[PDB]
Each structure stands twice: as structure tokens, then as C-alpha cells.
């Protein structure tokens, strides 16, 4: 009984297939700390995964997709090395963990031809227009905030560690009031609200590179300049507000950005299409 | 009265092209609020841009290359809108700053043609064998530190505001050594040499979300996990160091990774190959 987890077009997903990876997950998850969904939905996920792998792996079988031997060969030896292992000695580590050479070899090629016909197909799907590139590049210029030295002030409206939305909405709205009346000094308003060590000192954090800022701030100061007031940004400790005080590689950064931004969209899209336009029967 | 800035294959950059682009540059620098180098090396920058612009552009013609009349106009609309103006409003800005709209429109089509050619030509060069899309994919597996929880300790080594080679070297030296002893307690080395406040509490620094950390740590953290030592990293205050304490669509990340690094790598490669395959004399 090759118990069948499900049917994808003119082929199947087994319980073997599922009950297998379904483990390698909980392993390579508790082997790197990150906890997991419900064993119920986790399955449902591993299902969706395995189904898709089929559609597109069939799509593979349909089109003339082989993967050369030298190629697969190289491919393994390079993750052998990567996780701190070796050639023949690889064999006797998963062969010593439940598997064979061919539970991996044939199993990796499946990964490889899947990667192939999945890119190869969303590749033919993306088209960047000069307009898009030009337009974007002109904007990534307005942002030109690289190692952009930057003085700024700070207002903290702090929340407790784990508040309800009743404790949050007060700070949330209270900020936007200060946000507006800041634009109509901040330094005075900082002492009158801010709850950090540099609060009574007027929110004054001082000069400092945009890099040295907490990542989440650098995401919103990127598009701003002298006088600007960004926020209110919510983090671990509550809502922050900031007042700003001072300050042919764009035709590439633009393109790399689109050629990427687009591929990520026009792949999510390409499966939405393959999934919904195929035979997906699931046997409980 | 209009000289030749430079011959560049049988065709020229003009002193006018340059002294007009130096106008387009310091026009931004005052508004963008960033200083420029010596007007002497700066001319030698713009010169070098305009030279390159040319080598490419001559390729523009060499192989026929248009720009959709509609695209050109569109980008310009899109660049107008991106700056909070209509064409009608922008028009006046072109007049007030002093440029013929059609000098400008044609000036853009210049930019657009160049891009067309650089990109079209770099994309040509990029070759991604699967043997490497796999390997890399199975390297970002044990890495995906997205909105991760993360507890750290932290040494800091002291460095004055404007440091001296000796200090800086003898500092990084001590900072390396601490790290060399760090992979052999860390908290007890806080107390030893950490310049910072937390040192007594052990550099003990608590749970941070990777994104809430300073962006100049993030770079070297996503590729590391519990029990690891990071840095020494250079910053304003000086040299940091830190312990860690707690914590397909990766073939998407994987491909994008390459599709991207390979472009950036192979543009920079082709550029230098074109300034090579080229007569070019500058006439100051």
C-alpha cells in the first residue's frame, strides 16, 4: 500500500513523501532553534509544498528537462563541503541517519529540475520597461542616503511589555497629535513627553550615520532630509518619533531592484496559476 | 568658442556637455545638501562619466536602438509626478532654472538609450549554472534570520573622536585578541575591557529583534547563530564585539541572490571592458 497523500495532475504525492520531509523539518527546525506551526497545519503546509513540487516537476518531465550528471555531481559535493562534511564520508552520515545515496541523489535532481523549470518559466515572464527603470532610478536618487551623517531628536511614547490594543491605541493616537504639533519646537515637546534618558535633554540624540541607526529607522529616514519628521514607528518598547536636523550606478541599482522586485512577483503569480489550473485531489 | 572636452573614438565630448552637466550637478548638491570634491577632480569625474556615456551611446547607434516616443514622454510624466509636479508645473521649473524642455526631453532620451544598451548588454553576459543555484540555496537554509529574536552581550573598545593609527591598530589588535579568547567567559571580559555602560552587568544586553539592532551589526549577524562571536566591527565609538545567546522559496532567495550578484559583478566587468576597447584622449 503506497498510501497516497494526494493526486497532482497525472501523478501523486505519497504519505511516504510527506511523512518523510515532515520529519526533516522538525529536525532542521529544532536543530536551529525556530519553533513550528500546529502539527495539523504544518502538515497542510508540507502538503501544499509537495503538491507544487509535483505540478512543476511534471511540467519538467513534460518539457525536455534533464540535469547533467557532472552537474548534479558538483552540486552535492558543494553542500557536502558547505555544512562541514566530505565526499564518501557524506554517504555514511545520512546513510547513518535513515537514508541512502539514492534517497538523496535522485532526490536532489528533483530539487534541481524543479528550480530550473520554475525560474526558466518566471524568467520568460518578467519585462522591465525603460520608463520603469528611468522613473525608479530618478527616485532612488531622491533617497541617496548612503553613509548619510544625520542629526536628529527623539520622542518615546512607551508601552508596557505585552499590552492590549486598549493600552496601544492611546499611545498610537497620542503620537500623531505630537507629530502634527511638532510641525507647528520638538526639543520643548520632547521634555514634555519623551521617556528616554535623552528626554529632559530635549530628545537630542546627536549627529550619527544613518547606518549606525537601528535598522527600522534607516528604512524611513532613507527618503527624508533637513526638517523632516518621521514616525510614529512602533517597536519592542513603544512608539518613537524623530525630528531631522541636518545632512551611472542608479541606472543599475534601479534595474537590479526591478529585475528582482519583478521576479519575486511574477513567480508568486506563476504558481497561483499552476496551482489553481491543475488536478489537486487530497486523500485522507 | 565651444572646445572639445575629449576625443573618444572618432567623436567627441564637448566642453559644453561638461560645463552644462556641472550645472546639473551643483543644482542638486545644494538641494540634496551634500558636498562635492575638488572642482578639479570633480571635473575629472564628470569628464569620465561623459566619456563613458559616450562609449555606450556610440554603441547605441552601432546597433539600432530606439526609445518609444510614449516611453520617453511617460518617464518624464512619471518623473514629474515623482517630484510633486505636473508637466505644466515642471515646465516652469525648467524655465525658471533655465532649460529648453526639448533640450531636456532629448537629454533624458540620452539617459534612457544608454541604460537600454548597458542593461541589454550586461544581461547578455550573466550565466547561472544550476550546480551553483542549488549549493547557494542550501546555504541560505541555515541563515534565514528574518524578524528574529536575539539576545546578545557586547564589548566595546574605546576610540577617540579623531583617532590615531597607533590607537586604531592597537585597539583592533586588543579587540581581535578578545575575540580570539571569546571562542575559548565573555561577560567576564566585558568587565575586563568593555568601555561601555553594560560592562558591569556583563555586556548583558537582552533580547533584541535583529531589525531593531544598529544596521552595521545586522550585516554580520543573519549569517550567524547561538554561541557565535561577531566582529570586531568598526564604528564611531570604536570596535564592537559580541556574543550571541538565543533565537521552495529559499531557491527563490537563492536565484535572486545570483541573478543579482552576477549582474552587479558583470556590469562593473563590462564597463571596464569598454573604456578599454576604445580610443580616448582628454583635452583639459
Amino acid at each position: 500500500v503506497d498510501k497516497v497523500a494526494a493526486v497532482v495532475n497525472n501523478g501523486v504525492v505519497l504519505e511516504s513523501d510527506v511523512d518523510g520531509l515532515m520529519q526533516s523539518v522538525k529536525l532542521n527546525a529544532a536543530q536551529a532553534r525556530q519553533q513550528l506551526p500546529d502539527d495539523a497545519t504544518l502538515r497542510h503546509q508540507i502538503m501544499e509544498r509537495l503538491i507544487m513540487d509535483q505540478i512543476i516537476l511534471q511540467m519538467g518531465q513534460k518539457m525536455g528537462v534533464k540535469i547533467s550528471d557532472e552537474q548534479l555531481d558538483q552540486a552535492i559535493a558543494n553542500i557536502a563541503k558547505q555544512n562541514n562534511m566530505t565526499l564518501d564520508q557524506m554517504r555514511s552520515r545520512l546513510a547513518y541517519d535513515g537514508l541512502n545515496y539514492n534517497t538523496y541523489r535522485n532526490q536532489i535532481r528533483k530539487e534541481m529540475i524543479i528550480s530550473e523549470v520554475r525560474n526558466n518559466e518566471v524568467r520568460r515572464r518578467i519585462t522591465i520597461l525603460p520608463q520603469e527603470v528611468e522613473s525608479l532610478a530618478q527616485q532612488v536618487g531622491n533617497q541617496n542616503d548612503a553613509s548619510t551623517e544625520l542629526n536628529l531628536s527623539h520622542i518615546l511614547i512607551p508601552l508596557p511589555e505585552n499590552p492590549t490594543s486598549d493600552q496601544v491605541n492611546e499611545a498610537e493616537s497620542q503620537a500623531r497629535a505630537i507629530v502634527d504639533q511638532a510641525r507647528n519646537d520638538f526639543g520643548k515637546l520632547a521634555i514634555a513627553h519623551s521617556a528616554d534618558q535623552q528626554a529632559l535633554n530635549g530628545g537630542q540624540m546627536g549627529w550619527g550615520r544613518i547606518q549606525e541607526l537601528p535598522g527600522i529607522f534607516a528604512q524611513a529616514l532613507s527618503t527624508a532630509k533637513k526638517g523632516d519628521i518621521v514616525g510614529p514607528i512602533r517597536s519592542g518598547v513603544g512608539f518613537h518619533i524623530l525630528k531631522v536636523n541636518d545632512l551611472a550606478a542608479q541606472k543599475d541599482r534601479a534595474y537590479r531592484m526591478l529585475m528582482n522586485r519583478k521576479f519575486s512577483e511574477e513567480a508568486a503569480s506563476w504558481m497561483q496559476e499552476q496551482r489553481a489550473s491543475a488536478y489537486v485531489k487530497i486523500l485522507s | 568658442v565651444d572646445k572639445v572636452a575629449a576625443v573618444v573614438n572618432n567623436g567627441v565630448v564637448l566642453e559644453s556637455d561638461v560645463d552644462g552637466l556641472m550645472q546639473s550637478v551643483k543644482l542638486n548638491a545644494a538641494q540634496a545638501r551634500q558636498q562635492l570634491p575638488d572642482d578639479a577632480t570633480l571635473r575629472h569625474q564628470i569628464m569620465e562619466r561623459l566619456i563613458m556615456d559616450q562609449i555606450i551611446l556610440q554603441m547605441g547607434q552601432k546597433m539600432g536602438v530606439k526609445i518609444s516616443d510614449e516611453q520617453l514622454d511617460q518617464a518624464i510624466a512619471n518623473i514629474a509626478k515623482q517630484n510633486n509636479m505636473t508637466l505644466d508645473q515642471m515646465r516652469s521649473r525648467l524655465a525658471y532654472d533655465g532649460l529648453n524642455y526639448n533640450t531636456y526631453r532629448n537629454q533624458i532620451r540620452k539617459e534612457m538609450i544608454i541604460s537600454e544598451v548597458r542593461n541589454n548588454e550586461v544581461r547578455r553576459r550573466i550565466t547561472i549554472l544550476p550546480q551553483e543555484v542549488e549549493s547557494l540555496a542550501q546555504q541560505v537554509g541555515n541563515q534565514n534570520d528574518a524578524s528574529t529574536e536575539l539576545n546578545l552581550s557586547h564589548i566595546l573598545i574605546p576610540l577617540p573622536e579623531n583617532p590615531t593609527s597607533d590607537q586604531v591598530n592597537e585597539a583592533e589588535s586588543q579587540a581581535r585578541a578578545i575575540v580570539d579568547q571569546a571562542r575559548n567567559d565573555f561577560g567576564k571580559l566585558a568587565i575586563a575591557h568593555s568601555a561601555d555602560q553594560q560592562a558591569l552587568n556583563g555586556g548583558q544586553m537582552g533580547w533584541g529583534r535583529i531589525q531593531e539592532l544598529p544596521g552595521i551589526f545586522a550585516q554580520a549577524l543573519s549569517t550567524a547563530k547561538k554561541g557565535d562571536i561577531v566582529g570586531p566591527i568598526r564604528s564611531g565609538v570604536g570596535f564592537h564585539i559580541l556574543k550571541v545567546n538565543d533565537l521552495a522559496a529559499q531557491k527563490d532567495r537563492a536565484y535572486r541572490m545570483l541573478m543579482n550578484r552576477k549582474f552587479s559583478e558583470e556590469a562593473a566587468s563590462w564597463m571596464q571592458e569598454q573604456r578599454a576597447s576604445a580610443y580616448v584622449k582628454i583635452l583639459s
Binding site: 546627536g206 549627529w207 550619527g208 549606525e212 537601528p214 | 555602560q197 533584541g208 531593531e212 544598529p214
Partner: peptide, 10 residues
Amino acid sequence: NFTLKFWDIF
């Protein structure tokens, strides 16, 4: 410059 002053909020 402030890298720290600031980190010491998170």
C-alpha cells in the same frame, strides 16, 4: 557617534 546611546533603547 550615537550607535550605542540608541542601541540602548532595544
